[PDB]
C-alpha cells in the first residue's frame, strides 16, 4: 500500500494583520505589514465555533513566548458571525468573518498602526503515510502528531511531539455545519490540537 | 524539515512577561 | 546514472529575529516580527566554533547593502555555548545557542525593539547532478557553486556564482564534533562559503 492515509480534518485559525502606513503630504505607504496566523483556543472551537457559529474579534495566543493580544480593528472583543468565503473551482468548504483589510485614518506626517483579525475555518483533506506517526494538511502545514493519538484504548502510546496540553479529546461531539446551519446526529470523538500557528480538529 | 525549525530550535510553550 | 550526487555538508547561521511590541493597558501585542538568517563568518566558523565550540552572541553580515550588527538581548558580546538542539524523528545532528526568544520588558503605551540573535549550527545532506555546478541542502536552499569548487588541482575551473572573498578552503581541517566533543583524527580538506543567508561547510 503506497497511498498515504487519507482523512478529513478541520482548521482554525485567525490570520492576524497589523500593517505601518505613511501618510505623506499627497500619498499614502505601506512601512511594513506583518501577517501571521493565530490558532483559535479550544474554548473558542467548542463554545463559539461549534456551539454557536461565531469567532471573537480579538486573537489571544503565544508568539516567541510572549502573550500577544490582537483586536480587530482596536476595538473591543465581539462576536463575528462566520460567513461562507468567495467561490474557487476544485477548492473545499471555508467560511472566513472579515474580508475587508483595516487600516488606519489619514492623519499627515504620522506613522500609524491598524490590525486586522479574520477569524478563518477550513475543511481540508489530511493525509498520512506509515509509520503515520505524523500528518500533513491540504494547506501544506505538517502536524506532528498520530492522526489516531487519543487518551482511549491505548491510544495515548501513539508519537506526539506538542505537549499535553495543546491536545484535547472530546467525546459526543456533534459537529455544527456552519453553511446549513445543522447538527449532526451521530456523536464522534474529535480530537483537538493548538499548533503553534493553527488549530486542527479531526 | 523546515517546518520542524520551531520545534527543534526553540521554546513553544514557554511564555515570558513583565 | 540518475542518483544525484549525495554529499555530507554542515550550515551555520544566526537567526536574527527582532519583534516590536505594543503595551497597552492590559495587554500586548506583537506590532511587527522581522526574522533573518545572518551567516556565520569563516573566523567564527574556524576559532570559534570549530575550535571551541561557540558562536558569538552579535551577528554581524550585510543585507541589502548595509552592514547590520545584531546584538542578542541588546547585550553586549559574549562567547555561548552550543548545545544540542530537542529531539525529533528523522532529523540529521543540530545545535544551537539559545531557546527562548527575547522581548522587551512592559512599558506602557510605547512601542519597544527587541533583538535576538540564536546562532544555530546543522549537519545537512546535499545533493548535485550533472553537470554537478551547483547543489543543494536538506533545508531547500540553494547553493550556486560546484561541489568540487577549490584552489587545488585545477578545482578553480569548476562554476561558481559568488565572488571571490565569499570562499574559503582550509587544508589539513580536524572537524570538531560538538555533540562529544571530540576531534577528528583525519586531517580534512574543508570549504567554505559565506552564503548571503547562512555559512555552507563541506
Partial sequence: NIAPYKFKATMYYKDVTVSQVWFGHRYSQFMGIFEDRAPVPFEEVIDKINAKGVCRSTAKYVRNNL???????????????????????????????????????????????????????????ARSVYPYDEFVLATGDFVYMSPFYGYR?????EHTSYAADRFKQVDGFYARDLTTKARATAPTTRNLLTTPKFTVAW | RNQLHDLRFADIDTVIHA
Fill in chain 1, 67 to 125: 502573550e500577544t493580544t490582537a483586536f480587530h480593528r482596536d476595538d473591543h472583543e465581539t462576536d463575528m458571525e462566520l460567513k461562507p468565503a468567495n467561490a474557487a473551482t476544485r477548492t473545499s468548504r471555508g467560511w472566513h468573518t472579515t474580508d475587508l483589510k483595516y487600516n488606519p485614518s489619514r492623519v499627515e506626517a504620522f506613522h500609524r498602526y491598524g490590525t486586522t483579525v479574520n477569524c478563518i475555518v477550513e475543511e481540508v483533506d
Fill in chain 1, 153 to 157: 484504548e491505548g491510544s495515548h502510546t
